[PDB]
């Protein structure tokens, strides 16, 4: 209902965790679970590649269609770009329904 493709078997959840690294344990045995760990965090790169199938348009419409376009008029910043502080912004939501076909 929020939009998209419904699947019984969607892309699986990918779960990641840092393995706990205990600190120095006491020299005398204690049966309680360890609660002293080395403070750690992890970093790395993640890549995802998705192949999309396209349905081309075969319209016989004579007049030009409505198309999504940027506005040429001057502005302080370029839409869908970074600001002077390096902050990326999306200025508007973009749908998918601009081309037309008969009902």
């Amino acid at each position: 209902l929020m939009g998209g493709f419904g699947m019984k078997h969607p892309p699986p959840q990918i779960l990641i965790k840092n393995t706990p690294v205990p600190a120095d344990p006491p020299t005398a045995f204690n049966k309680d679970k360890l609660n002293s760990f080395i403070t750690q965090y992890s970093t790395g790169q993640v890549s995802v590649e998705i192949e999309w199938e396209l349905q081309k348009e075969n319209s016989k419409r004579w007049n030009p269609e409505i198309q999504y376009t940027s506005n040429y008029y001057k502005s302080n910043n370029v839409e869908f770009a970074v600001n002077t502080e390096g902050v990326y912004s999306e200025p508007r939501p973009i749908g998918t329904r601009y081309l037309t076909r008969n009902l």
Binding site: S59, W62, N63, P64, E65, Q67
Partner: protein, 104 residues
Amino acid sequence: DGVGSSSGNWHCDSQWLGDRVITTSTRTWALPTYNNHLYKQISNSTSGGSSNDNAYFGYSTPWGYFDFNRFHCHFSPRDWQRLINNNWGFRPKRLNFKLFNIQV
């Protein structure tokens, strides 16, 4: 062929391949008799003009001619929109021309 058989069909469509687009256009034309079958010498004197920048000499022929040297003769507005919004360049490659269904 014969009087009662068409000599061609109406072909008017655009086919969009990967790196190529093929435009086909068919039109109905009418051809009258020009100059009453005569060749006539023409000039700025025969059209009454007397400025030297507009002076000319030439001939008018009883022949007509077919001209399709404008882009809208081949591209519909939607095809033109697709071409201009999806391509960095284009150029003509080859031509096919047909005259058929002659009626005098």
